[model samples]
Target: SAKVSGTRFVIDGKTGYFAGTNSYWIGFLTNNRDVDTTLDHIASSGLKILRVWGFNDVNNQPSGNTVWFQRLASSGSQINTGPNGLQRLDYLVRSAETRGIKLIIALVNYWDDFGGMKAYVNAFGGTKESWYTNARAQEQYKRYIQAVVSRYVNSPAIFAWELANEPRCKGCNTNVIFNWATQISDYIRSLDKDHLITLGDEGFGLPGQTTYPYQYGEGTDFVKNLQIKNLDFGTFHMYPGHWGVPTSFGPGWIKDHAAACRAAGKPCLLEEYGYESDRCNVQKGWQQASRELSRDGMSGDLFWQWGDQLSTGQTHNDGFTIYYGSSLATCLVTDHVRAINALPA
Candidate 1:
């Protein structure tokens, strides 16, 4: 494992870069067979980083350790330990460790897929305005940080801890976005400073807006928040059609955030991107992202997802599942990884 130094990573006392992709459901949907197959794919692709889920608070989803990370019981008291409990996450970390894979553990989500930020909002009886300042929300989330980080702090396979997935304070004031991110990021660092910290944000960019069209409020102060003291690096997701933007906009967004990180003295990753469109759309968008990032001194870029083919169910495969052996763009990524790693940091 490595740690962030200025705008680069120091691995084994030398500069390091990584190629990774999102496999958010890896731990949440784990079995011995699934773990082996997943690693086989990731290692085969020559990727070193994997962005996966660390939170599974999808409420009232039937009990038992069936799902990955296993959704907590309604009471939220027991986390179901053992090979069937959070222990499965341990298995994932250990599994990746053996295969030289690193996991970026994301702790929360902005959507309702798993009760997300609503649990904190409801617990504290706060509205959207209170999302960043809610006492209960902050406290409980820190508790979550402790629970997850402590379990795997001893393992070198963990790459970082992300505060949330696509977190946005929609309709609320934007001033506190950095505050909320700082609070969580610092809290995690207080727990363990061994890895890295990022706010699993979908870097929403809409031309001159510096923000996007969908959600507002906690409008990712990408440069500002990523500059937070405790956060080790910056990241953003890119989806053109969903944002009603051109695919070419993807590279520009990557450059924008990368430049921000460079000035802020940190590394930036095009953490997530893809269109689930025709293979051409996917490939072009990916190429643009990687080419720009490689030139920018940013090492890793992860697509929206890979393997475990979950059903996006959309007509055009919007979930963008890239099968292990069959993804049309795998070679593109591997090729870029080799070339980029060849560049001097």
Candidate 2:
């Protein structure tokens, strides 16, 4: 497999548009035919990357599987065990590679679904206090880090090893969370050495009102506090105006966020951003923000999703939501894609 030298924004020495989608393809990949159309749509739009989950069906695993130690009893057992489970995920990666799309694998979903932070702390066989404060957790975390990184260390399509998707401090101490991130990042670099690493933190502007289970001050300043050394780039999900602010307020907000990342000596990965509807104002605002970020040297942007939720039957307010007359070919999707691609390389 050929390897691409990593960059603050570029991959393999080529400027990356970072225009991609976040996908929960595990269930879809279990039956390859399910993902064909959606993947085709993303690829057709000229996207070069796809952020995906490392574990999606875990909560549905049958009993007696210990591959997952989180909340086995309540959340069910590990689903992606044995040969079949592994193969399903591998197929998704291979399929994306064949389409010229890089895969940014999110190693873990969140601290909660796996039995919250306390559950994870206890499952590792340590007292709640020691789980975060203890040196043992760091040791065990390294082992887990090594396991995931070693699996795809040599794969060209593997873009980065995301530590966790929206980590929260929860019952754990802030310093402890920072320590865990630092140790895990260092452990991954030691094992893989070539790929990039990121903290997929949920974007929040307020200190305690963050969407994550634990409080970590919101905004780029909070990211600066993590202080993890090997973080090749910083990642955050932005939904500024959705929470309350007006749509018109988003562009300046994003510019400020990007500037914060640049000041910290890292490139901003507007990893997730979009609106709840396809209104012209919403689409135009998102496109304008994206273009301005690119012009200012921000690394990339990936929308909240690609296709509609398959099970919940609820459509996303984000641009990816599939509606009867509002497909990706709608003016909103095309306009955003064209604007992002037209950005200077």
Candidate 3:
């Protein structure tokens, strides 16, 4: 079975390592040329895992970062779009499996991007907190979960099933997130018993988070939230660019979260780490943090979104895109990947 045994990621009982991008649109943007370009670049870097969106709401509804992967109706039937309907996602999974890339898929999102929690609430008529308590919302979410697992249960492409992309409901007790995490994780386990499960949360107050500059006391408790009986591991996102922290201090967050994950007897995966390229030394600072965290026994660091705007500058300080070929940022990322990808000796 593919599992996270202690701090090591084991696939079929063999050690595994991860180093890749957080390409969230892989399912909706499932063109062969686009997908192949991304995969070819990722494969060249020697990275083994990437994260993508497992939920895209129902039809044309996302108000921001719009996507069209999922489909739902008042009749409880799905109507997905694509040349091959949901086969776009199927092709993506099969393609990644063939290319040896494992995916950590987020089942939903807290943000409005791709019609996140708002879509779920709208479809089933519940507040974010009530998405846990409401029977209709829970059943709908369970059906979506069943759809995804039933389609991809046999493939090795899926590494973990994340409950959501940093799931937190506003004005909600942290228990809301915990309840949903446990229920959803349990549903997935009931269907597919071989893959790992993690809560996609920023490890706030987890070991290194006490020194964090930005603190939102919403449902953002990573330590207790992820300590559920069924949760297999913990995941954190570090965006110093968004948090307005010095780029140099990014490594500290990585280390602190990893420390907390270890303390909880769970290996931590840094699934999202990024910086504004135009502001600070984006490549240099992130490279330093990635290497340091890897050595400190971090399960892995899959940096944030990739796109065409990586090289030669674009609008604003956005520099998370690590393009292919001999780009300088690409070199920094590949170098760090090679450094940490060494076998356990």
TM-score, model 3 to reference: 0.85
* Prediction 1 global C-alpha lDDT: 0.68
lDDT of 3 by residue, 2-41 (tens): 5776776775455655666777766766356567656667
Q: Please, what are the lDDT tens digits per residue for candidate 1 over residues 116-218?
A: 7775555556775576787656666676678889998888888888988888766555557778887778788888877888888875422234435323444
List candidate 1 stretches off by more than 4 Å: 11-14, 68-76, 122-124, 205-218, 285-289, 295-297, 308-318, 341-345
By summed lDDT, the worst window of 10 consecutive residues in model 3 runs over: 308-317
RMSD of each: 3.7, 5.2, 4.0
The number of clashing residue pairs in each candidate reads 5, 1, 0
- Against the reference, the lDDT scores of all candidates come to 0.68, 0.57, 0.68
TM-score of each: 0.86, 0.76, 0.85
For 228-318, candidate 2 gives per-residue lDDT tens digits of: 7876676767665445655665665566556656666666676776666544567567657766766454667777666643333444444
Pick out the ten consecutive residues of candidate 1 with the lowest summed lDDT: 309-318
